[PDB]
Design a protein around this ligand. Structure first.
Ligand SMILES: *C/C=C1/C(=C/c2[nH]c(/C=C3[NH+]=C(/C=C4\NC(=O)C(C=C)=C4C)C(C)=C\3CCC(=O)O)c(CCC(=O)O)c2C)NC(=O)[C@H]1C
Length: 307
């Protein structure tokens, strides 16, 4: 039936991806009522992240006891309080932990990750080399190929592609960089339903989406202290937001174990994405994420100017 097939296609765009009440297990998440300053939701894995800074905490139970001010660094709490704008993430890096938090209505949402030892000035020197290569490009075809190659080198993903939307949100792959033999994806077309409108809109909130392992077990948000409002909390601005299992299976069918995509914007208009696949699971720290986003933004700026 024709209208039935259309119902099914329309269901794609209606899965509530913004409120899964779970996360990917490469970080831990705390949800805290702003006025109560009380921990109301915590990921089922919070223990193994806050046990790195605080040794009193070894179980999810201990988080009901825990105070925010022992768990979170002070600059994080001060920035989150002194922040008026909703959904704009603050980042605070201790000696052991990398925090990203933001305010959404009466909720503070805090994501915490681990990180590797860093090399000073590496972020900036890498961006400098990308800035110079993208700026020396004089046609869009050199620009986009250069972009895929740089994203490939910075991230180390097995495959980096530029996926360009047409006026109806259908898209095609227009450039490719690979770390191994692959059958070409060049000029392969995909329908608009493969990235439903809700996912397309998510790049306007967080321009990078990151999936380190398609088979990693999502961790649900447990209730800690009974929140005033039991509505689902919107997790859109972070990176830990659990992945729609449909898209996980889509990645498996692709032969992919890790994914990362970055929106390509012209002003507020989503023009396309950088799509990144890995055959084995892969994680990339916050600094590689920010470098990728910043590289894509400079490439976009160049893309709208050159012929
Ligand atoms: C009925 C629903 C469907 C559906 C849902 C869905 N898809 C995403 C997210 C993404 N889909 C992407 C598609 C592509 N990746 C590629 O490499 C290519 C072509 C080479 C395409 C077309 C991409 C890139 C994303 C972003 C995530 C990522 O980078 O992997 C979501 C959002 C999931 C989430 O963000 O939690 C949803 C709900 N896909 C379908 O095919 C139908 C069945």
């Amino acid at each position: 039936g024709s209208d039935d097939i259309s119902k099914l296609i329309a269901a794609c765009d209606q899965e509530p991806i913004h409120i899964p009440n779970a996360i990917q297990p490469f970080g831990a998440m705390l949800i805290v009522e702003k006025d109560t300053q009380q921990i109301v939701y915590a990921s089922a894995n919070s223990a193994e992240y806050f046990s790195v800074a605080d040794n009193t905490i070894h179980e999810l139970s201990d988080i009901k006891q825990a105070n925010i001010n022992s768990l979170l660094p002070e600059h994080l709490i001060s920035g989150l309080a002194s922040a008026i704008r909703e959904n704009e993430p603050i980042w605070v890096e201790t000696d052991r932990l990398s925090f990203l938090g933001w305010r959404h209505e009466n909720y503070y949402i805090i994501e915490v990750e681990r990180y590797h030892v860093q090399t000073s000035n590496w972020f900036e020197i890498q961006f400098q080399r990308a800035f110079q290569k993208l700026r020396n490009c004089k046609t869009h075809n050199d620009l986009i190929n250069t972009l895929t190659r740089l994203i490939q080198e910075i991230s180390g993903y097995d495959r980096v592609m530029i996926y360009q939307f047409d006026p109806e949100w259908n898209g095609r792959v227009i450039a490719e960089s690979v770390r191994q033999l692959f059958t070409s994806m060049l000029n392969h077309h995909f329908p608009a339903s493969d990235i439903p409108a809700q996912a397309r809109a998510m790049y306007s909130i967080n321009p990078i989406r990151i999936i380190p392992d398609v088979n990693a077990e999502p961790q649900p948000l447990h209730m800690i202290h009974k929140p005033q409002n039991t509505e689902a909390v919107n997790l859109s601005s972070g990176v830990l937001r659990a992945v729609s299992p449909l898209h996980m299976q889509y990645l498996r069918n692709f032969g992919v174990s890790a994914s990362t995509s970055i929106g390509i914007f012209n002003e507020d208009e989503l023009w396309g994405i950088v799509a990144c696949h890995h055959t084995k699971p892969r994680a990339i720290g916050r600094r590689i994420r920010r470098l990728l986003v910043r590289t894509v933004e400079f490439a976009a700026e160049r893309l709208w100017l050159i012929h």
